[PDB]
Design an enzyme around this catalytic site. Structure first.
Site, PDB file in Angstrom:
ATOM      1  N   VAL A  67      -6.925  -8.606  -7.084  1.00  0.00           N
ATOM      2  CA  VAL A  67      -5.946  -9.666  -7.284  1.00  0.00           C
ATOM      3  C   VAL A  67      -6.246 -10.698  -6.204  1.00  0.00           C
ATOM      4  O   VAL A  67      -6.457 -10.346  -5.039  1.00  0.00           O
ATOM      5  CB  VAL A  67      -4.509  -9.142  -7.125  1.00  0.00           C
ATOM      6  CG1 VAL A  67      -3.515 -10.282  -7.298  1.00  0.00           C
ATOM      7  CG2 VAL A  67      -4.251  -8.041  -8.149  1.00  0.00           C
ATOM      8  N   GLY A 116      -7.074  -0.057  -5.853  1.00  0.00           N
ATOM      9  CA  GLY A 116      -7.712  -1.315  -6.208  1.00  0.00           C
ATOM     10  C   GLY A 116      -9.219  -1.329  -6.010  1.00  0.00           C
ATOM     11  O   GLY A 116      -9.737  -0.764  -5.047  1.00  0.00           O
ATOM     12  N   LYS A 117      -9.936  -1.971  -6.928  1.00  0.00           N
ATOM     13  CA  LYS A 117     -11.386  -2.062  -6.818  1.00  0.00           C
ATOM     14  C   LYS A 117     -11.762  -2.896  -5.593  1.00  0.00           C
ATOM     15  O   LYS A 117     -12.932  -2.986  -5.219  1.00  0.00           O
ATOM     16  CB  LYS A 117     -11.961  -2.662  -8.104  1.00  0.00           C
ATOM     17  CG  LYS A 117     -11.750  -1.737  -9.294  1.00  0.00           C
ATOM     18  CD  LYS A 117     -12.021  -2.405 -10.634  1.00  0.00           C
ATOM     19  CE  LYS A 117     -13.490  -2.711 -10.841  1.00  0.00           C
ATOM     20  NZ  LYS A 117     -13.711  -3.277 -12.205  1.00  0.00           N
ATOM     21  N   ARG A 119      -4.033  -8.000   5.733  1.00  0.00           N
ATOM     22  CA  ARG A 119      -4.760  -8.459   6.907  1.00  0.00           C
ATOM     23  C   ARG A 119      -5.047  -9.960   6.912  1.00  0.00           C
ATOM     24  O   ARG A 119      -5.560 -10.491   7.896  1.00  0.00           O
ATOM     25  CB  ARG A 119      -6.073  -7.689   7.045  1.00  0.00           C
ATOM     26  CG  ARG A 119      -5.916  -6.244   7.519  1.00  0.00           C
ATOM     27  CD  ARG A 119      -7.277  -5.659   7.864  1.00  0.00           C
ATOM     28  NE  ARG A 119      -7.214  -4.415   8.632  1.00  0.00           N
ATOM     29  CZ  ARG A 119      -7.421  -3.202   8.124  1.00  0.00           C
ATOM     30  NH1 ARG A 119      -7.703  -3.053   6.836  1.00  0.00           N
ATOM     31  NH2 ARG A 119      -7.351  -2.133   8.906  1.00  0.00           N
ATOM     32  N   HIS A 159      -0.825  -5.142  -4.585  1.00  0.00           N
ATOM     33  CA  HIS A 159      -0.112  -3.870  -4.650  1.00  0.00           C
ATOM     34  C   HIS A 159       0.865  -3.877  -5.822  1.00  0.00           C
ATOM     35  O   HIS A 159       0.937  -2.922  -6.599  1.00  0.00           O
ATOM     36  CB  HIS A 159       0.691  -3.646  -3.369  1.00  0.00           C
ATOM     37  CG  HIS A 159      -0.132  -3.650  -2.121  1.00  0.00           C
ATOM     38  ND1 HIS A 159       0.159  -4.460  -1.045  1.00  0.00           N
ATOM     39  CD2 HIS A 159      -1.192  -2.894  -1.746  1.00  0.00           C
ATOM     40  CE1 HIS A 159      -0.681  -4.200  -0.059  1.00  0.00           C
ATOM     41  NE2 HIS A 159      -1.512  -3.254  -0.459  1.00  0.00           N
TER      42      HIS A 159
HETATM   43  C1  LIG Z   1      -5.123   4.446   0.169  1.00  0.00           C
HETATM   44  C2  LIG Z   1      -4.473   4.238   1.554  1.00  0.00           C
HETATM   45  C3  LIG Z   1      -2.982   3.892   1.358  1.00  0.00           C
HETATM   46  C4  LIG Z   1      -4.560   5.555   2.345  1.00  0.00           C
HETATM   47  O1  LIG Z   1      -4.076   5.360   3.682  1.00  0.00           O
HETATM   48  C5  LIG Z   1      -5.214   3.116   2.362  1.00  0.00           C
HETATM   49  O2  LIG Z   1      -6.582   3.500   2.561  1.00  0.00           O
HETATM   50  C6  LIG Z   1      -5.128   1.751   1.683  1.00  0.00           C
HETATM   51  O3  LIG Z   1      -6.073   1.318   1.039  1.00  0.00           O
HETATM   52  O4  LIG Z   1      -3.972   1.040   1.800  1.00  0.00           O
HETATM   53  P1  LIG Z   1      -3.854  -0.564   1.535  1.00  0.00           P
HETATM   54  O5  LIG Z   1      -4.793  -1.283   2.434  1.00  0.00           O
HETATM   55  O6  LIG Z   1      -2.346  -1.019   1.858  1.00  0.00           O
HETATM   56  O7  LIG Z   1      -4.196  -0.918   0.008  1.00  0.00           O
HETATM   57  C7  LIG Z   1      -3.496  -0.029  -0.887  1.00  0.00           C
HETATM   58  C8  LIG Z   1      -4.138  -0.197  -2.271  1.00  0.00           C
HETATM   59  O8  LIG Z   1      -4.073  -1.606  -2.577  1.00  0.00           O
HETATM   60  C9  LIG Z   1      -5.335  -1.987  -3.171  1.00  0.00           C
HETATM   61  N1  LIG Z   1      -5.570  -3.426  -2.956  1.00  0.00           N
HETATM   62  C10 LIG Z   1      -5.538  -4.098  -1.758  1.00  0.00           C
HETATM   63  N2  LIG Z   1      -5.793  -5.360  -1.941  1.00  0.00           N
HETATM   64  C11 LIG Z   1      -6.003  -5.583  -3.261  1.00  0.00           C
HETATM   65  C12 LIG Z   1      -6.313  -6.720  -4.054  1.00  0.00           C
HETATM   66  N3  LIG Z   1      -6.465  -7.960  -3.468  1.00  0.00           N
HETATM   67  N4  LIG Z   1      -6.456  -6.565  -5.390  1.00  0.00           N
HETATM   68  C13 LIG Z   1      -6.314  -5.374  -5.985  1.00  0.00           C
HETATM   69  N5  LIG Z   1      -6.023  -4.278  -5.279  1.00  0.00           N
HETATM   70  C14 LIG Z   1      -5.862  -4.339  -3.931  1.00  0.00           C
HETATM   71  C15 LIG Z   1      -6.372  -1.127  -2.406  1.00  0.00           C
HETATM   72  O9  LIG Z   1      -7.619  -0.965  -3.082  1.00  0.00           O
HETATM   73  C16 LIG Z   1      -5.622   0.201  -2.194  1.00  0.00           C
HETATM   74  O10 LIG Z   1      -5.927   1.161  -3.214  1.00  0.00           O
END
Ligand SMILES: CC(C)(CO)[C@@H](O)C(=O)OP(=O)(O)OC[C@H]1O[C@@H](n2cnc3c(N)ncnc32)[C@H](O)[C@@H]1O
Ligand SMILES: CC(C)(CO)[C@@H](O)C(=O)OP(=O)(O)OC[C@H]1O[C@@H](n2cnc3c(N)ncnc32)[C@H](O)[C@@H]1O
Lengths: 283, 283
Positions: free
Chosen positions: A177, A148-149, A188, A38
């Site tokens: 990431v 994020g992808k 999670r 994030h």
């Molecule tokens: C868009 C939301 C907020 C709508 O409720 C929800 O669906 C959501 O996704 O929230 P969330 O699960 O908290 O993730 C928020 C953003 O962080 C990105 N993200 C998570 N883990 C990542 C990682 N390891 N590397 C790069 N990016 C990462 C996700 O693709 C998402 O766009």
């Protein structure tokens, strides 16, 4: 010194004034329990936009009856601290009733893009995603929104929604990431037992494998899928929910690879259901 | 003197620039073939907002196969002139393919508000309405959007969509503008034969009757409906499709009146299907 905005009304009032002035807005929607995945998007926004807004909202509409809504990590004080050091301007943390003051009189649903993979495994999940993302785009009115992808299907769907609804928002997708051992960062991951934490590292390992096979020239989906599946099954004891090869962002299953695709995984542990993927190819 | 903007791309570009320069925006969505009903909304906007945008788009999504899509009056040159005379800045006149470049990947549907009255008689109509209005709101990014109470059910649904999607748009509803004899102005009146035109005046006269009965104390919906119906049947040869009493803006059928309601009509002539209504009551 990041401001914490707690209501939709105050958030919108701030953004309307910013938008009517020349200030560019960067937006990072999240469900809290922030990690470097994030923060990477936040840092990106802070170095590009006048103001950066981060939303922290566990959206009930995108959680199924037998999923982890009740256990999802919630730690706003820490999230606020992590965001402050990055230099973000605001953290939007609304109440559920503020976002959803009552029965929705209008409903939004995803079409074909949600009939496969995660959409088929989590019925209605993406309808909940687009519902809240649409609202957040209208509340924050960003010029750029970062995703994020890591959630590839989600990304494709949000992009489709931006197109279909004509949102004046440019979507920026950031690469996955990962922890030092390769594990894709995710709030999670806290659900993982000290043992699962080790087994879970093989999702990324299997993707490195898939990538190498592709790099060497393999284009038959079944060959890659079998190698990846065989590897996982001999390194993890959990149940493998998915190992697939689909075009990206079209999301059409491919048996032979001649264009851009994404090899995705879904694995269900004790309570933590993890996903990972690699997007590769040009067409 | 009004500019005719023909593409979504150019319209959004102009709007973005307007926002950056602190320009307040008034918007009047229409399907063209403008009359003073439309112009009244344009005038209001021109007197309040920095710029006023009038869209002219016969939305195919809100017309059923059995309706009047092919005959709907189209006269952009005329519309442009009328709008120029009142001082509107822009007339947005997009191509159908520009608004809907392909098959939508996300679908928007109205809930309970579309299960009655016009929604029941025209299934899918309001889904079409909210779909295009949502898009227009994101394209035009208005501060104020003007609608006529002539389409009272439409108005309630647009307001509900504005609430559910958190659109930073203030909806301004205007009273029904009528011809000298009382006939509610509508682009579809051009469909009326000389005979039907004079018969059509009775829709408004039947509502004056309904109002008088209500003024005197009548609160039994059946009594008002029967009186209005027999009056219409005794003055016009056309079929009365609807004479109803529902709460407003809740849209719940009322058999006995104890709050704010709207008495609506729908009459089908040889080609023209006209509607009219009156909103009365405290709560
Ligand atoms: C868009 C939301 C907020 C709508 O409720 C929800 O669906 C959501 O996704 O929230 P969330 O699960 O908290 O993730 C928020 C953003 O962080 C990105 N993200 C998570 N883990 C990542 C990682 N390891 N590397 C790069 N990016 C990462 C996700 O693709 C998402 O766009
Ligand atoms: C919103 C649209 C443009 C979406 O396609 C479409 O549904 C539509 O309604 O187009 P249209 O039928 O062209 O009407 C455009 C606006 O004009 C208002 N209007 C029409 N006749 C009126 C009258 N006699 N007095 C006051 N207001 C009047 C309507 O309520 C509507 O909001």
């Amino acid at each position: 010194m990041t401001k914490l905005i707690t209501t939709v009304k105050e958030m919108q009032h701030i953004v309307k004034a910013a938008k009517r002035s020349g200030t560019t807005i960067g937006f990072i929607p999240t469900m809290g329990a922030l990690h470097d995945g994030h923060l990477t998007m936040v840092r990106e926004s802070v170095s590009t936009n006048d103001i950066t807004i981060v939303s922290v909202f566990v959206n009930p509409l995108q959680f199924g009856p037998n999923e982890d809504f009740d256990a999802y990590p919630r730690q706003i004080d820490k999230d606020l601290e992590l965001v402050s050091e990055v230099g973000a301007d605001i953290v939007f943390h609304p109440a559920v009733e503020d976002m959803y003051p009552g029965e929705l009189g209008i409903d939004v649903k995803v079409g074909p893009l949600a009939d496969v993979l995660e959409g088929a495994k989590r019925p209605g999940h993406f309808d909940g995603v687009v519902t809240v993302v649409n609202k957040l785009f209208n509340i924050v009115m960003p010029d750029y929104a970062y995703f994020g992808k890591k959630d590839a299907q989600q990304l494709a769907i949000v992009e489709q929604m931006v197109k279909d609804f004509n949102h004046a928002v440019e979507i920026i997708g950031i690469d996955i990431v990962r922890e030092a051992d390769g594990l894709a960062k995710s709030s999670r991951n806290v659900y993982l037992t000290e043992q699962e934490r080790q087994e879970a590292v093989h999702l990324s390992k299997s993707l490195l494998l898939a990538q190498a096979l592709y790099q060497d020239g393999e284009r038959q989906s079944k060959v890659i899928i079998d190698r990846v599946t065989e590897y996982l099954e001999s390194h993890i004891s959990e149940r493998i929910e998915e190992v697939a090869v689909y075009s990206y962002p079209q999301l059409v299953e491919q048996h032979e690879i001649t264009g851009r695709i994404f090899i995705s995984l879904a694995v269900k542990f004790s309570k933590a259901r993890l996903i990972d993927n690699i997007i590769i190819g040009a067409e």
